[PDB]
Design a protein around this nucleic acid. Sequence first.
RNA 1: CCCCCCCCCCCCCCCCCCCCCCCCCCCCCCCCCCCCCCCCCCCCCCCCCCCCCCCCCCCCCCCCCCCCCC
Lengths: 369, 369, 52, 369
Amino acid sequence: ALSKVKLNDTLNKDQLLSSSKYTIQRSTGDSIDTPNYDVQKHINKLCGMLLITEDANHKFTGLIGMLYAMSRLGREDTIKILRDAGYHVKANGVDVTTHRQDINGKEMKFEVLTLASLTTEIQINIEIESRKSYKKMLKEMGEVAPEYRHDSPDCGMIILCIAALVITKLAAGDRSGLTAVIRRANNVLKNEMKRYKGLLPKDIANSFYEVFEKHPHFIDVFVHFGIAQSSTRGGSRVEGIFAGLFMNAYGAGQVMLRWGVLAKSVKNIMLGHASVQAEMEQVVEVYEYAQKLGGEAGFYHILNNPKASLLSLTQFPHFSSVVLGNAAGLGIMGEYRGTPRNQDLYDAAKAYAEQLKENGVINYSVLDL
Amino acid sequence: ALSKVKLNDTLNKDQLLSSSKYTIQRSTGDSIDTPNYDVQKHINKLCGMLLITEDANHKFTGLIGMLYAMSRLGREDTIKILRDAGYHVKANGVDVTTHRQDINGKEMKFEVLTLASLTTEIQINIEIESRKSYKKMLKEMGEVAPEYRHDSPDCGMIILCIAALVITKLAAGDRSGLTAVIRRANNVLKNEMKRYKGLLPKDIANSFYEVFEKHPHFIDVFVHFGIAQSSTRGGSRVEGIFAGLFMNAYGAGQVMLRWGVLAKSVKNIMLGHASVQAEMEQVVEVYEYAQKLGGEAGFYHILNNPKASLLSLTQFPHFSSVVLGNAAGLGIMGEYRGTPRNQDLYDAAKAYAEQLKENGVINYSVLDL
Amino acid sequence: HFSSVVLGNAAGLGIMGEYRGTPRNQDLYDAAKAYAEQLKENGVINYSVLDL
Amino acid sequence: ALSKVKLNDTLNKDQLLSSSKYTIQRSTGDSIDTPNYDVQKHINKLCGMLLITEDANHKFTGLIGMLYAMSRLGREDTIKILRDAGYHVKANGVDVTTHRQDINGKEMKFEVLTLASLTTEIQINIEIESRKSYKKMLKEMGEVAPEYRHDSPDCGMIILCIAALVITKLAAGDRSGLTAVIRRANNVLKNEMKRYKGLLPKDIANSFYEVFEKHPHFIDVFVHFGIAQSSTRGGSRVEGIFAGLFMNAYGAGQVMLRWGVLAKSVKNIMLGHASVQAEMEQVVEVYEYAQKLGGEAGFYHILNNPKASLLSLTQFPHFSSVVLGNAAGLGIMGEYRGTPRNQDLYDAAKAYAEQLKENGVINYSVLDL
RNA sequence: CCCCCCCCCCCCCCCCCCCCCCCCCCCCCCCCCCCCCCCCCCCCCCCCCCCCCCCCCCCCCCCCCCCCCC
């Protein structure tokens, strides 16, 4: 029977990758600092001092946000995440200590952290800039409120909201989503961009881009922190904003699956073409694979999971071209920089999707009605 | 088959969030006072003294109501709630002690509580104001009744009724439901607003708004206290009022689901439009998700649960516009400040819902009858 | 009632012109006119309601 | 039942027009010459003399061709045709006689016809021109053949072939098909355009246009002559050419019916639009009417039959626009000067018909396959 | 009002048939017994009963139709 001349390549590749009986273990290189719940207050203080500092220097904001996320997770869970990701990690204990230095010819008390990645001078200078900006702004408006201070419990979570936007745009492969990050961080968080002098979305976004590029394990740590944070029973409104912006990253890098479901929903006719119907077997194969994967598959492209390539639909040029055409016809493709590889099917689907709005729907009374 | 080109994104996101294998643990900052059953009588006395004090100062009423709720729960359950919500809490023991001070040049006996959040001066001044207001009102009417006193066992529960109204309106994101809280606290509790001189709904509502804004964990504590209180076998009539007002908050922030069920019930025709039928698959997805969640989902938006965004229907502009139009046509939309994002479907549904009252119903004898 | 519905449908489709006959059920006339107008922006209405 | 709210206007109009119990009888004005079989040879001689005359004057060729057709029919059938068409006719007997005149100072014998419409001078001058052209061409090539002479039995039938082309293009309402007539008379009849010096398609076509414009009863006579000629058991090859060119006129003025059948055959999707399906009832009404009419309906527009307007499809703007779009997309519309009255449906159908050639066909596996 | 475009057709190859073959052939008359049929008893019917009985005229309002475009 010709019906059994078939090969389930996607499922077989998945079974090969999921049934490996040997494991690799990478070496991060530089030692990882693992803060615990103890220093969460101090890291939040540092984030607040960065936020209240106008004309601020955000060169180190990405690392400080990563430290805050790791302190929220805790040392045990951070270590367990790093092992489960397949890393050899030098767990570095983080504890708070005092440092005494004379600036302006006056003895001064600073409370800093033992971070191998972040030197004492940097934290001291962050405090100095924050203090003098606070002095100037207190002079210019008289009395402060808990709104204008580093002691707010959500100062770190605003920075992590910026990180969540960066994560949403990470799947583009470079810093091309920086403009989108800035635009969305101006739409969202506009009250904060009033309230905090140093909340500069572009600088923080660039810092997080840099830290994610240099340390790929921080992407894994941040994704699992975001999943753990989104699994809480509740929280403040800033944590709700972070959860909403983080789940905006679910399915990033897999827009074609959603647009294919959309093209099925609007019932585009060019799904009835000969070549599309030729590829439909493996297309349904891919969709069933995505469903069997389920929730974990939504962050494959952000995490650079090796099995991300199994979810691709560009390996079916005709179906992909029809899907892109339908997306462009419905007016939702935007600046999507993926290009069709069957221009004719793309144009036909685009035209039909455009007439799907002036000419509402097409019946199929043809053929017996 | 084109029927298997589908993705269950809502369910996959829920499974991802519910199957997390790492947890975060937040730090509240300031220490939490955890009163036990021992001081419930004294906290109720404090609430009664606040209530019988005319022209009262309600700056601290929200914290005192929170303390009363936590004393009703007990220290064990309050601590367990705070852990289950994912908080690091400094459990502060609350016990009663005496303080002696000379006011009016006379030695005076006061019995106060060891609360870190509430200083002794504040409790002393509350007692002073209550005592002199009691003296003045006793002078002006001769003899008091158990109706006019702080020893009533429901004085704290009236304050918690005001808190329940504030909770009902918390999902609006700000203090825009203050007018509704005042109106409902005048409709309900009018006998009390006679009986108690200091029962000022606006001041207590503002105090509870402030305490819920500053301490997001108090929202969790109060919601679980309200659930535990509503699980009792019975109580007084004020506790019944509190239970009725608290379950008025169930489903807050999710009005569109109820209005969609309503639009299905009145059988609005614009549910048969092309785009609405395109979105119906994911709409049924969302409704099945809400049902699988069940009872716990009714307080997701009040608690700022991260999975609250999964219940949204505004991600389907056409269905949402039809639902808003049907609600506006039936005359129940009120001042709902959500706006349609398909004006045409909104207007069509509104018009049909309006003719659903003069022109009772429409048969579908068209097509074969 | 039927005449009013018919006039409303004619006016909604934009073909009634200066037809000087007038409806004697204004409500049905207006309802039919409105539905006929939405029959052009909102192409057709399915009846998936009731078992589909 | 709403299914019986229907009116069969086309069929009712046809029954009204076909069941009239009173008849009109028009008056042609000028007397009609009715030649019989006797003078067929002489009229064919006259046509041959016109054909062999180079640089000829074809002012009277249309009338001579009409006389030849009427002589082929016979006087009885010509009279019966004129009565059945509803005309009052002065039947004029045509017989041959001799006329003697002196040209070049020499007595000369001419044999002419008693035609009221055609004077003796005209026939004499036709003979003179033919004779001297024959003399010149005999001088220039030495000896003639039966190919180069007026005695050929098909000289009149070539002129009637030109008349048949003019009839094919008569439905355009004016002399706009003159270029098409000339082009087709050059493609066909090229051997004759060699063989006959005076076979000028444009002059003969203009003469036939003039005679058909002045005498509308000659259109009826010629159409019924062409039907009678095409009902013969056989004939020469020129008569076969005439029959082929005459049946090319069948269905002239009714191209939209054929193009609608074509759009049904290629299964254009825009036949499933809402408005097209609204009009399909009366469209099928018109097609059933055309079939009930049958063969006689193919010459309604040429004859200006009053019931020609009942076969129109432009009374259904959406279906007509779809049909024109399908015709233009398939590349067969040419210079058809009818214009769509729904531009959107026209463009949509044109686009789909164009993709019907690169994208062969579209399956309807959508909806359950 | 309607209509409006393009378009002659044809074109090759090809007689068919061809063999063998008379059919039949035997045996065989059919029938054969026994047997008339019927047979009893029995007229049928039988009573009671005329039918009907009331109430009730009917009706009553409003309303020309049409109107466009082609």
